[PDB]
Amino acid sequence: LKAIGFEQPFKLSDGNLFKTFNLDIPEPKVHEILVKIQSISVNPVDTKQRLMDVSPRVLGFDAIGVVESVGNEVTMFNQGDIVYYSGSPDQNGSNAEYQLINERLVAKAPKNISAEQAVSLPLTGITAYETLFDVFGISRNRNENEGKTLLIINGAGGVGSIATQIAKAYGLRVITTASRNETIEWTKKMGADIVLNHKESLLNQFKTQGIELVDYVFCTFNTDMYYDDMIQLVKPRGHIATIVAFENDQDLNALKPKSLSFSHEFMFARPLNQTDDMIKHHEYLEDITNKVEQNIYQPTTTKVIEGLTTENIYQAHQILESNMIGKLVINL
Amino acid sequence: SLKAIGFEQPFKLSDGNLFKTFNLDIPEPKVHEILVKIQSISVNPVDTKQRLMDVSKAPRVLGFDAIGVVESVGNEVTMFNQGDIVYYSGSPDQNGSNAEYQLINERLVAKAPKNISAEQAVSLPLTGITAYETLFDVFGISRNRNENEGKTLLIINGAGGVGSIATQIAKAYGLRVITTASRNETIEWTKKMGADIVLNHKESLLNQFKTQGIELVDYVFCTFNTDMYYDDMIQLVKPRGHIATIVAFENDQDLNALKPKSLSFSHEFMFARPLNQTDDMIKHHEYLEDITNKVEQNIYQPTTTKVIEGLTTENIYQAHQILESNTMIGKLVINL
Ligand SMILES: [Mg+2]
Ligand SMILES: [Mg+2]
Ligand SMILES: [Mg+2]
Question: Which residues are listed for Mg(2+) binding in this entry (chain A) (predicted)?
Fold first, then answer.
């Protein structure tokens, strides 16, 4: 099988240091299933994971494809199944013709949309579900979330786009931020109830528009810039979280006056730590599938590139690092 | 008129006993306020920190733990009658308990337990409300014992005021509690409070977990020197776990250290509810009432270990010195 990888970490200005590789096709460990890949997505993380040492390295943490084979302990899937998933950065990525993945991290993909559209959803969707249900602790019952408001700083990114949809489906009011006609229209398309401009004072906008302090705040870009804003905008005893690493250390005492909680969401904590509850990833992907088939969620692919090649993956990293509305996808 | 102990400007204890005795009018309670004739008070770390704040209008009167008898009530109070024996903590934005009388909103008060003395009961309001918020609000433990069984709390520095009562609460609600203590006095005391396992925070905590076969914990909170133990709390908590402090950091911290295990970090502040006049201020009443019920059932024990007799400037000063020394086990009380 073919794969795109690298031997050492690099910045793009170093040059295109992706190379092709020819590997075997293994058999699936007992709870593993083996997947022939149809399409993949590129995520901020691939650009971040490209900088780490190499213990080649093969990136890719979004995939959809057809189940080639499964292991003797598999009860969840069959050869033939069209499945999508994210996986984990300590196993070779989806940047390959074939890929091994544990069954508990996978779900059948929706069939009422194209493969290239459905593959916009696994990494971003799992991340958003973990943020809403595990971190913030919203109810699976829509009525129990009545009166709750979520603020998403940067609604137009991959996680922002799907989290908006999920939060709406589960009964929340969703406020997002977007600062140009293109990102404003997109977040509105995703279901935002109120759109604010993150390049101008947010608290001012809350005051102007009569917006009360929010239950939960979720930052998806430049958290250093918005740490104090998140604290100002959340209600006492509320909860703020990020999915973007900070560039600098912060004052945790700033959380004291309102007795706040701060969470750093990382969707790979479950697989990386082989947690008892890795199955939640399957459960979240399955809910996504159901809601896509119901037309409650819509996919978020806006750019498609054809061919899993070193020139392509490099271009995709150039694009991700420019900081995209919705998702970038590559078809094999 | 009423005697109150207070001060005109923030000061260090090295500046001497600048507490002063004031003669003040006895207030009348507003609609939902009660007027309490104070019997006993406790002195807490927060007293010593608040003694460093600018005084907006003189004098500043501290004191954030009280028990006494209801003298009167505002005209829509329904939760209490004249004569009721009640206890509470209150809030730093109003005159505190270092006085013969005090006003407090009814939603922040509960009747005290009847089976222990006033000097024992007053050890409980501030530490207990802080422990209930940490466990129920911050960590989100269940009111249902079964939902908590199989879970473990670690308390770093377990023998202080909040650590003492939290150990009891957590045990009552079904958790395993691991505490840390590093000298004979504190080890014995935390065991007496109910700790299942006691570890030494002067030695590698992770090495103690490995060698004793301790699984990573569900919840960690730190009651002293959080800068020193931040990285430890991250090491010892389970993936997607929750860590918290009730004391301020000296230094900024790397919040990316929370990322690998997708962790939550909370800074618990007991006064956030009254200071923001939150809609759910009644939780303070609710937690104080649960403490009273469990004391009367002999499930919780009071934590007073030192008593000073007399509300005087000398005694308040001596209490501040004792608290600043960070050597107290359990609680220090002053009887009026
Ligand atoms: Mg299932
Ligand atoms: Mg929670
Ligand atoms: Mg009641």
Answer: 282, 286
Among A302, A163, A332, smallest CA distance to A242 is for A163
Q: Cα-Cα-Cα-Cα dihedral of A106, A101, A74, A282, to 10°?
A: -20
Strand, coil or helix: what is B17?
Answer: coil
Whether residues A131 and A144 fall in one domain: yes
Distance A277 CA to ligand 1 centre (A): 13
The closest of B216, B136, B258, B253 to A262, measured between CA atoms, is: B258
Q: Over the range B290-310, which residues count as b (16 or more CB within 10 Å of their CB) and which as e?
A: bbbebbeeeebbbbbeeebee
Domain that holds residue A144: 124-270
**Cβ atoms of B64 and B97 closer than 8 Å:** yes
- What's the gap between Cα A192 and its chain centre? 18
- Contacts (Cβ under 8 Å, ≥6 apart) of A184: A178, A195
d(CA B291, CA B133): 13
DSSP annotation string for B184-253: HHHHHHHHHHT-SEEE-TTS-HHHHHHHHTPPPEEEEEESS-HHHHHHHHHHHEEEEEEEEESS--SS-B
Are residue B252 and residue B294 in the same domain, yes or no?
A: no
With contact defined as beta carbons under 8 Å apart, do B9 and B55 qualify? Answer: yes
Q: In terms of domains, do A295 and A316 share one?
A: yes
Cα–Cα distance measured from residue A35 to residue A58, given in angstroms and rounded to the nearest whole number: 16
Give the CATH number for residue B15. Answer: 3.90.180.10
Q: Give the span between the Cα atoms of A305 and A41, in whole angstroms.
A: 10
Nearest to B262 among A237, A251, A269 (CB): A269
Q: Which class for A75: exposed (0-12), middle (13-18), buried (19 or more C-beta within 10 A)?
A: exposed
Nearest CA in chain B to A135: B264
CA dihedral A135→A205→A161→A249, nearest 10 degrees, is: -50
Burial classification of residue B250, based on how many CB atoms lie within 10 Å of its CB (0-12 exposed, 13-18 middle, 19 or more buried)? exposed
Asked if the Cβ–Cβ distance from B266 to A267 is below 8 Å, we say: no
| Claim to verify: residue B263 and residue B295 sit in the same structural domain | no
For residue B286, the CA-to-ligand 3 centroid distance in Å is 6
Q: CA gyration radius for chain B? A: 20
Map tokens 């404003």 to a residue. Answer: A184
C-alpha B79 – ligand 3 centre gap (Å): 7
Distance CA A285, CA B139 (A): 27
Name which of A136, A225, A259, A279 to mutate to probe chain B: the one with the most chain B Cβ atoms within 10 A of its Cβ.
Answer: A259
Report d(CA A271, CA A282) in Å as an integer: 12
Q: CA quadruple B296, B298, B300, B305: dihedral positive or negative?
A: positive
Interface check B278 vs A, CB under 8 A: yes
Task: With H, G, I as helix, E, B as strand and everything else as coil, classify residue B34.
Answer: strand
Q: What is the resolution of this structure in A?
A: 1.6
DSSP structure class, residue A253:
G
In the block, residue with structure tokens 């299933």: A33
Q: How was this structure determined?
A: X-ray
Verify whether the Cβ–Cβ distance B272 to A130 is below 8 Å: no
The full DSSP string for B276-324 is TT-TTTHHHHHHHHHHHHHHHTTSS---EEEEEES--HHHHHHHHHHHH
Our separate counts of H helices and E strands in chain A read 10, 15
| CA A33 – CA A40 distance, rounded (Å) | 17
Number of Cβ atoms within 10 Å of the Cβ of A97:
17
On whether both A110 and A130 belong to a single domain, the answer is no
